[PDB]
Write a protein that binds this ligand. Structure first.
Ligand code: CDL
Ligand code: CDL
Ligand code: 3PH
Ligand code: 3PH
Ligand code: HEC
Ligand code: HEC
Ligand code: HEC
Ligand code: HEC
Ligand code: UQ5
Ligand code: UQ5
Ligand code: UQ5
Ligand code: UQ5
Lengths: 70, 59, 157, 48, 243, 376, 376, 53
């Protein structure tokens, strides 16, 4: 099953010799900031393009409705 | 640090044929408690608006 | 892990019961289990059939000769012995459900050697009172729950 | 040749049969299905 | 076009809007009485039965007495003819007309639609219904209305065939509530909102139980996920590569 | 190779083109491909039928009539779908009798036999609830008689019965759910057929000689494609005769009457392929014992790879006993279409007793005696 | 050892229990299990709803109402089906966007991408013909508008339209055949999903790093079962909220009016998951050109594994252009729900042109430039 | 009537048919030949076979 040549030492601890969810509270703000640091540019360019084009379209639609008035 | 007791392990945890009926009775009581809490909160919030409140009011 | 498995077992049971209780009888099916019949439009010596829960119920205004003949039937000849007074409170008005306990067929009124009900499916035979006379039907015809109304009406159920 | 052929040839001895403890541990699953059915149906105080 | 769209309806503070809130069952009862005396002369509600009002709106005996005051066609009898009888619990609500064509003929060509699902069948349902019932205003300049039609800016197009039907004191409530036009409109809107979603209270109770159970199970499953993945997330690999 | 670069072509090549098959297989090894062809035909005709059928009382009979007289090619589709069930059961029954004759379920092909028995049970349920759908007198009264047989299990009887019916009698909810169950079950049949064929390919097929055939194997896709095509053309001839010349020969005339719950027909019999089970049930004068015997027949069918010793020729006593078993089963098929009579009750009881005797006493004990005679 | 004795245990063990999987898979690799679970949910709730639905134009709406009010748990089943369709489309669209972001269709996984595009087309057709079954105003008029696109084909357009309708207009035969096709196509979806998953197991999954992962593989059953359970519970929360608190949020109020072929609604709109295709169609003032543009969109989706270069995080120019593509498809979704207007026509035309530019110009050429930047 | 119309019915429902014929329903004759065992022979014999008991 796909022999891989490799030289290493691997260590593993029992899952009943460590904690489960206690470190999740410590790392939660750091992980939040790291997520937004990594995906900040893409989410921002998505938001700018989508909301800008939607806002321009809705504004010009409102102007079109106003132009039909008497 | 916190660790399950040995005497409580040897009774309710070592065999699956003892673990499963304990699981079912715990499931029954958990469902009863959740039903009680949800119903009490709903009846307390909407007091005076239900049909049973009108019926008990007309007694 | 046991605490989570409590809620896992509860959710599994609730989902299974919600799936199963969708083939049960609907609300309009349950509402249509009741019947009121006027006996003023019934002639004597005639059998009328009504739809009570999809089961053909034979209501025959029994004549005094028919009442005497049903009272003259000995319990020894009946495979399942039951007296005529133990079935209908009023011997004149007979309310009998026409379903065979053998397999589920329907007897025919006005046909048979006993001047009663003859079942064509397997040769089962019934008298004027709903009692087995000959054939592979092992049990008597069921009398449903009904009560007499003062305005010549019978409510079944 | 799995089934009656195993017992015709003499391959089912007093040995190679399950022990009393094995049959009791398997036989303890009878209460689990009873409790599971009673949990699923819930016929409370239905015992006569 | 704005005139074809019609005027939008404002958002009214209904007491059943929140997911924790039930219906006002006293308002359903008063709303049904507006239905019987004003609505039902020309609206059918063909998917309602008297059996469904029991335990929501009336007791069994009250609903039986209400159903027994209606004439229901039944048959055929043993002579192959059609007769009439008293309504019962399993009977549906009476329709004022036998068919769509006579309903159109009685109303200038317009068919008054069924009201069982009119609340969920319109955009902004209860608010539109209330504003339509209380909103027969004067037409603006340059808008003329033909005969047989009445102005209502909430109706799309502005020209409805339903006249003003709610009047002050036109219903005599049995709980002492004074019956202005707005109170009648609010009660019938509540009844119609119940008619579109008859099990909203039961759905919300089940949803509260389901959301609580799934929210607890999410934490338990996250615990069992992190327990299984712990020997991998904390493993130590040492190799000769530095790069 | 082109088939070595796409994994779909590799599986298709391995299992349909280059699959090694014994070269001495006769024409009694064409039952399986014919059964698969009949399953595909039934699925196609039914999917076409469901575009004109309405699964409601007071519309079902009229929708079948509108299908028969107004839909272009609709009469062909209906008669093909009706007679295809009969031909499907003919082919599957001959397949099972082949496996009974040759001992085809023995080691190592027990999974093949067990999956076949499961397929047969699903076929029976599918055909019954599909027979209910036209909503005639035979449909209604057969569905009434069979589903009101759950009142033999003690205590939990009529509860299960009323939950099946969706009410208190066979009515519109029963028909409406029977339509959905009948549409759905043939896809389970197709999946079980794929699993059944895949279980056979682990060890390959037996041969008429009953010996190891690993030395003489040939490719499937060239030699056994035309051999299957010949039998398929014979089956198409019989199918075309049944559709176009005798379309109502295998049916019952009472199913052309609209269903009446208050009037029962004189004789209530199922389709012909259900008649042997009906005779077993009707012969025993107890409902619970009849259901127990019907269950025991299928339990003995499941237990056949683990109790059945003895194959085709060169095992001549069990070979001769097979013909008595075939006569017994055909007699039970004939008895199910008759009326209840003391002589027919006695003969049906004797036939059921001999069926159990052959399935549970002859196959192990006579087979063991044959092995002791031949290799003892 | 015990799974070595039965084939079915061995296949299940290999492909579900001991299947090697990259250890660094994040929660973007849960869309496939969620899509499979939503398909199973749709099949179960649809099979249960079919026992109470009647496919006739006089009883369809009425049976829907009766199932809503009178059938026990019928409202839960009906709302679960109608909102599980939307959640199915959400999960599948996020799965496809994951594949577009990481370039997962590339070699050696071209078959996986192609079977995925086939699955998505079958899914679209299944949902469209399922929406016609309630026989409301939107159900009638959307089927009228969409099946009238066949007349854009010259000469033989109206003949294909009348053949699909069964008449001169959308009526009862259309509803009956749509019901049969709608019952049938989910089983083809299940088969296609089995083939699609077995195609991926030939080589395995890609990882978020985009590198070869054969040095770091762990068992699927012990590790990714729990990780899939977590995402299934997050999906069950959203499902519960949509079923119980906001059941008509993702629907249309006009589908609660019975169908009227003599009075069209003012704003005929589809469900939200067909709105981007509808915006592509409405933006072009030519029916044949709109149908061709939709076909070219799906052809570009088929041709992605052979024209697409550029993958995950380390290929940064295409990674930045992915978010522009995502904004474009959501703008197409929003534009479909709005009325025809010169500015919406212009913006829809520009958005369609940008979608074609991203699919056919950015993915080959910018991918080639970044391969030359990184490894030239 | 027109060509698309069905054949006219003598009565309005089953109960009027039983009322006009002494409590017996004259069955529908569209599928009566396929609805009886040995159909056309039985119909001919029944039509011409009113003899003494
Ligand atoms: C609230 C504000 C909303 C906005 C912020 C969102 C959360 C903030 C942090 C974000 C984050 O990185 O999430 C992972 C974050 C930490 O991640 P990490 O340790 O760096 O890496 C682990 C992986 O990221 C995660 O991989 P994992 O599989 O190892 O962890 C699974 C599990 C981690 O397991 C947990 O610890 C979660 C526990 C669930 C609570 C349920 C409680 C009810 C029942 C209790 C039963 C528990 C039994 C245990 C009892 C024994 C205890 C001794 O996480 C979850 O599935 C929970 C939700 C996590 C985010 C999902 C939403 C993202 C989009 C935002 C939408 C909001 C708008 O975990 C949490 O959010 C849980 C802690 C709670 C945060 C509150 C503030 C703390 C100060
Ligand atoms: C949703 C489907 C994914 C569920 C994954 C199954 C599982 O491992 O049980 C978790 C979970 C059991 O809860 P748990 O107590 O946290 O897990 C048991 C121990 O943590 C650890 O139990 P374990 O390590 O012995 O679990 C091995 C697992 C065998 O796991 C496998 O081989 C998984 C094969 C299918 C993967 C499905 C991925 C989608 O067999 C079982 O015990 C459960 C068999 C049911 C499948 O499954 C459930 O019963 C939850 C509802 C899912 C239906
Ligand atoms: C006349 C009708 C009146 C209608 C009034 C209601 C219109 C809609 C509500 C108002 C919407 C405007 C603010 C929306 C804020 C949403 C959040 C957001 O953008 O954050 C995403 C995003 C968050 O990034 P993340 O936190 O990294 O995900 O924020 C940005 O990156 C900033 C986005 C700024 C770009 C959009 C600016 C507004 C466009 C208006 C263009 C007008 C053109 C005029 C041309 C004609 C002149 C004659
Ligand atoms: C014999 C014993 C067998 C084992 C039984 C274990 C049961 C608890 C396990 C557990 O998770 O505890 C450890 C853990 C804390 O253990 P500690 O170290 O003692 O703090 O507790 C939890 O994780 C919280 C468990 C939440 C409850 C789930 C089961 C009960 C359902 C009812 C929920 C509350 C009612 C609704 C109220 C709504 C708000 C008003
Ligand atoms: C998107 C994928 C999808 C799949 C897969 C699917 N359905 Fe549905 N189905 C729908 C949609 C959409 C509707 C319309 C729901 C609505 O608006 O009421 C629907 C409605 C129905 C209806 C009409 C009842 C009603 O509530 O309108 C039936 C019957 C039905 N589906 C059966 C099935 C069956 C049977 C299966 C599977 C074997 C299935 N469906 C799978 C999407 C799907
Ligand atoms: C109760 C038993 C049984 C049933 C029912 C059954 N099979 Fe078979 N089938 C077998 C056995 C045993 C074999 C192996 C025969 C041998 O190799 O000697 C077999 C072999 C086959 C073969 C290989 C060719 C052949 O005919 O030997 C095919 C194909 C096949 N089955 C398909 C089907 C299909 C399709 C169905 C039903 C739709 C079906 N079978 C029903 C038991 C059954
Ligand atoms: C094993 C047998 C079998 C299979 C497989 C089968 N059917 Fe049929 N089905 C029947 C029988 C028998 C009838 C009764 C036909 C009759 O007597 O008119 C029937 C009747 C029907 C009817 C009612 C219309 C009519 O003419 O009776 C429909 C619709 C139908 N089937 C659809 C299907 C569909 C759809 C499938 C598969 C996807 C299918 N059937 C597969 C046996 C089968
Ligand atoms: C148009 C694309 C597309 C569609 C639609 C699609 N798939 Fe996927 N799917 C992929 C690709 C590509 C992969 C391989 C991605 C990888 O492993 O990095 C994949 C992987 C998977 C996986 C493995 C893990 C994962 O989530 O990536 C599963 C399971 C899966 N698909 C199931 C499904 C099911 C079930 C459906 C629909 C009913 C579906 N897919 C629809 C393209 C698709
Ligand atoms: C005249 O009368 C008769 C019939 O009538 C025409 C018959 O046919 C039969 C033949 C039927 C037999 C032998 C029994 C059929 C087998 C079973 C298990 C009964 C069918 C069970 C049902 C309908 C329960 C509901 C389940 C359904 C619809 C599907 C379940 C779903 C799955 C398994 C996935 C006989 C004997 C009969 O004398
Ligand atoms: C590393 O990558 C992988 C994943 O990702 C993390 C996975 O998640 C999975 C597991 C795949 C899952 C859960 C998807 C579900 C699979 C399919 C093929 C969906 C289609 C199947 C359906 C709808 C079954 C329903 C039909 C039935 C039961 C037949 C009808 C019969 C009856 C009702 C009796 C695998 C193997 C995987 O390798
Ligand atoms: C309210 O309503 C509406 C819908 O609905 C919810 C819609 O979706 C749409 C628009 C949807 C689009 C453009 C995407 C989906 C497009 C198509 C063409 C769906 C495919 C369906 C077709 C062609 C119907 C024909 C059916 C067949 C061929 C059955 C399949 C069987 C076989 C191939 C053998 C609109 C406008 C609509 O207003
Ligand atoms: C002992 O030696 C053997 C035989 O004896 C000589 C056999 O006979 C067979 C099996 C024969 C097979 C597989 C061919 C018979 C056909 C079957 C089972 C299916 C019938 C299907 C047909 C005619 C066409 C179906 C068409 C379509 C489009 C359906 C597919 C659907 C989609 C692609 C969506 C095997 C394996 C064998 O070892």
């Amino acid at each position: 099953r796909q022999n891989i040549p490799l030289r290493e030492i691997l260590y593993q601890l029992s899952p009943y010799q460590q904690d489960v969810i206690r470190q999740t509270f410590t790392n939660a703000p750091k992980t939040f900031l790291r997520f937004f640091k990594e995906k900040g540019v893409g989410l921002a360019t998505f938001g700018v393009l989508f909301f800008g084009i939607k806002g321009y379209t809705e504004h010009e639609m409102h102007q079109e409705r106003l132009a039909e008035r008497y | 640090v916190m660790r399950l007791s040995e005497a409580l392990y040897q009774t309710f945890f070592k065999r699956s044929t003892v673990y499963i009926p304990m699981l079912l009775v715990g499931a029954y009581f958990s469902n009863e408690a959740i039903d009680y809490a949800v119903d009490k909160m709903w009846t307390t919030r909407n007091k005076g608006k239900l049909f049973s409140d009108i019926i008990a009011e007309r007694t | 892990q046991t605490g989570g498995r409590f809620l896992y077992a509860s959710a599994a049971r609730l989902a299974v019961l919600k799936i199963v209780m969708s083939l049960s009888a609907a609300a309009d099916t349950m509402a249509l289990s009741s019947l009121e019949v006027d006996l003023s439009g019934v002639e004597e010596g005639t059998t009328i059939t009504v739809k009570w829960r999809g089961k053909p119920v034979f209501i025959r205004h029994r004549t005094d000769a028919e009442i005497a003949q049903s009272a003259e039937v000995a319990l020894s000849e009946l495979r399942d012995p039951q007296k005529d007074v133990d079935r209908a409170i009023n011997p004149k008005y007979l309310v009998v459900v026409g379903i065979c306990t053998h397999l589920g067929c329907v007897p025919i009124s006005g046909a048979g050697n006993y001047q009663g009900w003859f079942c064509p499916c397997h040769g089962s035979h019934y008298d004027i009172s709903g009692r087995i006379r000959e054939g592979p039907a092992p049990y008597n015809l069921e009398v449903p729950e009904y009560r007499f109304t003062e305005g010549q009406k019978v409510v079944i159920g | 040749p799995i089934g009656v052929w195993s017992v015709f040839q003499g391959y089912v001895t007093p040995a190679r049969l399950p022990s009393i403890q094995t049959l009791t541990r398997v036989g303890a699953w009878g209460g689990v299905v009873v409790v599971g059915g009673l949990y699923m149906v819930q016929p409370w105080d239905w015992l006569a | 076009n704005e005139a074809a769209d019609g005027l939008h309806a404002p958002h009214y503070p209904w007491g059943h809007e929140g997911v924790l809130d039930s219906y006002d069952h006293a308002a359903i009862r008063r709303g049904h009485k507006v239905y019987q005396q004003v609505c039902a002369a020309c609206h059918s509600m063909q998917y309602l039965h008297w059996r469904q009002l029991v335990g929501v709106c009336y007791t069994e005996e009250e609903a039986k007495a209400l159903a027994a005051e209606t004439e229901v066609e039944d048959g055929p009898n043993d002579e192959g003819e059609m007769f009439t009888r008293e309504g019962r619990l399993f009977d549906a609500f009476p329709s004022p007309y036998a068919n769509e064509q006579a309903a159109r003929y009685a109303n200038g060509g317009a068919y008054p639609p069924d009201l069982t699902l009119i609340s969920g069948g319109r955009h902004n349902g209860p608010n539109y219904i209330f504003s339509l019932l209380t909103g027969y205003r004067d037409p603006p300049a340059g808008i003329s209305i033909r005969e047989g039609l009445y102005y209502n800016p909430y109706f799309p197009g502005g020209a409805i065939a339903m006249p003003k039907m709610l009047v002050d004191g036109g219903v005599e409530y049995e709980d002492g509530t004074p019956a202005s036009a707005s109170q009648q409109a609010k009660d019938i809107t509540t009844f119609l909102a119940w008619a579109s979603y008859p099990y909203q209270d039961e759905m919300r109770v089940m949803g509260i139980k389901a959301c609580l159970m799934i929210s607890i199970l999410i934490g338990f499953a996250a615990y069992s996920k992190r327990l299984r993945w712990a020997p991998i997330k904390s493993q130590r690999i040492v190799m000769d590569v530095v790069n | 190779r082109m088939h070595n670069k796409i994994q779909l072509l590799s599986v298709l090549n391995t299992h349909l083109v280059a699959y090694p098959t014994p070269m001495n297989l006769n024409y009694s090894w064409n039952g399986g491909s014919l059964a698969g062809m009949m399953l595909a035909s039934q699925m196609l005709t039914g999917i076409l039928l469901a575009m004109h059928y309405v699964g409601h009382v007071d519309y079902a009979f009229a929708s079948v009539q509108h299908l028969m007289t107004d839909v272009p090619s609709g009469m062909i589709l209906r008669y093909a779908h009706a007679n295809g069930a009969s031909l499907f059961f003919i082919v599957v029954y001959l397949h099972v009798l082949r496996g009974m004759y040759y001992g085809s379920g023995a080691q190592p092909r027990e999974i093949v036999w067990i999956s076949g028995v499961v397929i047969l049970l699903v076929m029976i349920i599918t055909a019954f609830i599909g027979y209910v759908l036209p909503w005639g007198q035979m449909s209604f009264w057969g569905a009434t008689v069979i589903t009101s047989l759950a009142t033999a299990i003690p205590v939990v009887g009529k509860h299960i019965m009323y939950w099946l019916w969706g009410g208190f009698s066979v009515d519109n909810p029963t028909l409406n759910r029977f339509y959905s169950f009948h549409y759905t079950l043939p896809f389970i049949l197709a999946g079980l057929s794929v699993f059944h064929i895949a279980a056979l390919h682990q060890y390959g097929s037996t041969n008429p000689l009953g010996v190891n055939s690993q030395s003489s194997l040939i490719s499937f896709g060239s030699y056994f494609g035309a051999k299957d095509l010949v039998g398929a053309l014979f089956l198409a001839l019989v199918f075309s005769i049944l559709v176009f010349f005798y379309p109502d020969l295998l049916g019952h005339p009472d199913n052309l009457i609209p269903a009446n719950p208050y009037s029962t027909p004189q004789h209530i019999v199922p389709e012909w392929y259900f008649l042997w089970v009906y005779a077993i049930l009707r012969s025993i004068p107890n409902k619970a014992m009849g259901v127990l015997a019907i269950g025991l027949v299928f339990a003995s069918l499941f237990a056949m790879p683990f109790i059945g010793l003895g194959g085709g020729k060169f095992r001549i006593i069990t070979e001769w006993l097979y013909w008595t078993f075939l006569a017994d089963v055909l007699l039970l098929t004939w008895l199910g279409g008759n009326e209840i009579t003391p002589i027919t009750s006695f003969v049906g009881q004797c036939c059921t007793a001999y069926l159990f005797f052959y399935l549970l006493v002859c196959q192990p004990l006579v087979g063991y005696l044959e092995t002791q005679f031949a290799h003892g």
